[PDB]
Amino acid sequence: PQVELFVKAGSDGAKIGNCPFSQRLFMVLWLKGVTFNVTTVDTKRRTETVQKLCPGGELPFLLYGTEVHTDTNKIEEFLEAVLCPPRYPKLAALNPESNTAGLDIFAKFSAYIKNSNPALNDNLEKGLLKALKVLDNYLTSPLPEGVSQRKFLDGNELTLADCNLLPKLHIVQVVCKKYRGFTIPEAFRGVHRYLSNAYAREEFASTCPDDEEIELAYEQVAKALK
Numbered sequence: 580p581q582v583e584l585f586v587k588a589g590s591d592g593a594k595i596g597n598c599p600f601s602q603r604l605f606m607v608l609w610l611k612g613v614t615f616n617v618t619t620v621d622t623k624r625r626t627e628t629v630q631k632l633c634p635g636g637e638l639p640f641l642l643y644g645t646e647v648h649t650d651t652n653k654i655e656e657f658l659e660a661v662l663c664p665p666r667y668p669k670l671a672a673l674n675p676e677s678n679t680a681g682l683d684i685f686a687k688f689s690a691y692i693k694n695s696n697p698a699l700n701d702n703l704e705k706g707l708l709k710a711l712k713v714l715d716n717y718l719t720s721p722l723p724e725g726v727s728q729r730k731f732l733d734g735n736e737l738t739l740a741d742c743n744l745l746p747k748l749h750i751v752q753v754v755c756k757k758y759r760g761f762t763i764p765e766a767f768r769g770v771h772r773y774l775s776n777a778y779a780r781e782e783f784a785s786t787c788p789d790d791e792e793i794e795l796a797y798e799q800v801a802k803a804l805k
């Protein structure tokens with residue numbers, strides 16, 4: 580049954596664009612091992628065919644046979660349910676906490692990077708560091724369930740939880756380094772090992788837009804502190 584994912588185009592109207600939701604779904608589809616195709620969409624200059632399959636302009640979106648699916652959460656739920664054992668592996672996490680750990684980081688990053696006043700930067704940076712620390716503690720602490728030194732959020736295999744979080748953390752890293760010279764403290768070993776382990780996996784590394792695309796995507800979002 581034909582699978583086609585539709586994602587946002589980057590700076591040249593063609594490359595895969597910066598977008599954590601698209602990357603999340605790309606990762607899920609790759610980890611499932613299903614045959615699928617991808618199509619990029621220049622939100623301004625969309626094609627006639629795309630203007631019809633998805634009139635509301637939602638992105639990403641997924642075609643399953645001739646059926647269009649929208650909303651990243653709903654698409655992911657659908658894929659986990661229909662691409663299932665024995666043909667395709669179950670990707671859901673075992674430990675519920677894995678599905679929330681570190682997701683507050685992205686919001687904290689956003690607030691931090693859009694602010695330009697140095698008086699407020701002190702507080703936003705500390706809140707970002709605190710959220711990184713909370714994730715670091717999750718990664719270094721043993722998990723309740725699972726047959727810490729594990730590679731990923733929930734054990735040693737990538738799960739749906741990593742597909743959501745990794746694309747966001749990657750953006751946090753790339754954007755923070757470029758626009759603020761900020762790096763995730765080396766003191767946070769759980770976070771750095773997670774990112775190193777994730778980078779070593781094609782499913783994550785290969786689905787990241789290039790750094791230039793990510794930076795350019797933030798050009799009118801990210802501010803230098805005055």
Ligand SMILES: N[C@@H](CCC(=O)N[C@@H](CS)C(=O)NCC(=O)O)C(=O)O
Pocket residue numbers: 587597598599600601638639649650651652
């Ligand atoms: N509600 C959608 C949100 C998707 C979304 O945020 N898409 C982004 C990036 S792919 C977007 O449309 N960005 C447009 C822009 O800011 O220019 C979902 O969660 O699936």
